[PDB]
Amino acid sequence: GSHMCDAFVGTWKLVSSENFDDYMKEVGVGFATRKVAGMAKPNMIISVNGDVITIKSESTFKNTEISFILGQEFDEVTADDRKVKSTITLDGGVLVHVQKWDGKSTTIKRKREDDKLVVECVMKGVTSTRVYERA
Length: 135
Ligand SMILES: COc1ccc(Cc2n[nH]c(=S)[nH]c2=S)cc1
Prior knowledge:
By secondary structure, the protein is mainly beta. Helices cover about 15% and strands about 55% of the residues. It is classed as lipid binding protein.
């Protein structure tokens, strides 16, 4: 049967980005990775099997994959090579992904808005908005 996380499932392509270089700077990403990652045009592939959600990010820069259960912490190696402890929950229909490392924290929110999947990335004060559409 259906679940509310159904509206996220599918294959999504990046269609716009704003402020991503400044977000990456705030996170601590170095120059060369920021340039190559900022050029990426990832696809995001989201699937669900039982309680396990899988999110893949695929681009010329990096191919990543995370699988998780809502509310249950996991260790993640990010595309920019941070080793983080992540927890993802659903808060009023928004997937909220918190990454903790070296005493720092960033939050990535994913929500459905019209036919878009909007990704908002926040690192102290700095937000980047990345908009995806169905592939
Ligand atoms: C903090 O620097 C980062 C750099 C790149 C990535 C990979 C990625 N994943 N997801 C989206 S929306 N876009 C991209 S390019 C992740 C973090």
